[PDB]
A paper describes a structure:
The chromatin structure is altered by modifying the DNA–histone contacts, thus opening up or closing down sections of DNA to specific transcription factors that regulate the transcription of genes.
The Ssr4 sequence has little homology to other sequences in the Protein Data Bank, so the structure was solved using an iodine derivative with SAD phasing. Auto-Rickshaw was used to find the iodines, phase the data and build the initial structure via Buccaneer. Although the sulfur, bromine and iodine data sets all showed some anomalous signal in the scaled statistics, only the iodine data set had sufficient signal to solve the structure. The N-terminal tag used for purification forms a helix from residues −9 to −2 and there is a break in the density in two of the three structures where the residues Ser1 and Ala2 should reside (Ser1 is the last residue of the tag and Ala2 is the first residue of native Ssr4). We have crystallized and solved the structure of the N-terminal domain (up to residue ∼180 of 395) of Ssr4 using an iodine derivative.
Residue numbers in the entry: -11 to 180
């Protein structure tokens, strides 16, 4: 009466390792962790669309040799790129960023496949910023057997996009609890 949707995504025998690792985390932090690949990606400025498609395509081909950990992500620096496992019908865990506007959802046709682009401009870190300075993009490429994997990218906003920021009217509306617990799991696989 609480976890039906999550349970659908943990049916795989390789998703058994992910499930076992999540159950090792205190219940209160299970909703707070990202399932993030142990790469790490080199940081990058805003990526051209063909680069996004190649990065997700290569990740999908390398998946059996890439491990994941449940981890907290908080106030990642500009340039940060992550490969994450996430159900599209579940909310993203927190990253410490708040937004003065709604995330916009665009779809592109790429070589006959759909690339989803979830672009959240007007990002800010309320503990340290009074104006917006950051963009977060979440990408996924559909119909190539990698539907629940995302590229998540944080980068610097343009000066002209910067607007005054106030947590009282931002999304999400609540500041996360600091300091963060240490909760990073040992690595596991999502395909064998
Ligand atoms: Cl475990
Ligand atoms: Cl808006
Ligand atoms: Cl998938
Ligand atoms: Cl929200």
């Amino acid at each position: 009466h609480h976890h039906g949707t999550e349970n659908l995504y943990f049916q795989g025998s390789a998703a058994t390792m992910a499930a076992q690792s999540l159950l090792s985390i205190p219940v209160e932090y299970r909703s707070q962790v990202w399932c993030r690949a142990n790469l790490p990606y080199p940081p990058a400025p805003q990526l051209p669309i063909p680069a996004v498609v190649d990065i997700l395509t290569k990740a999908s081909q390398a998946l059996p040799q890439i491990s994941f950990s449940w981890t907290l992500i908080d106030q990642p620096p500009d340039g940060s790129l992550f490969l994450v496992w996430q159900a599209p019908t579940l909310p993203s865990p927190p990253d410490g960023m708040h937004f003065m506007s709604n995330e916009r959802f665009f779809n592109m046709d790429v070589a006959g496949k759909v690339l989803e682009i979830h672009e959240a401009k007007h990002g800010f870190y309320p503990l340290s910023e009074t104006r917006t300075m950051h963009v977060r993009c979440r990408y996924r490429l559909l119909g190539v057997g990698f539907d629940n994997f995302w590229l998540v990218h944080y980068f610097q906003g343009s000066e002209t996009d910067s607007i005054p920021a106030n947590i009282s009217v931002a999304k999400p509306p609540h500041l996360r609890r600091y300091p963060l617990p240490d909760v990073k799991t040992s690595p596991f696989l999502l395909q064998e």
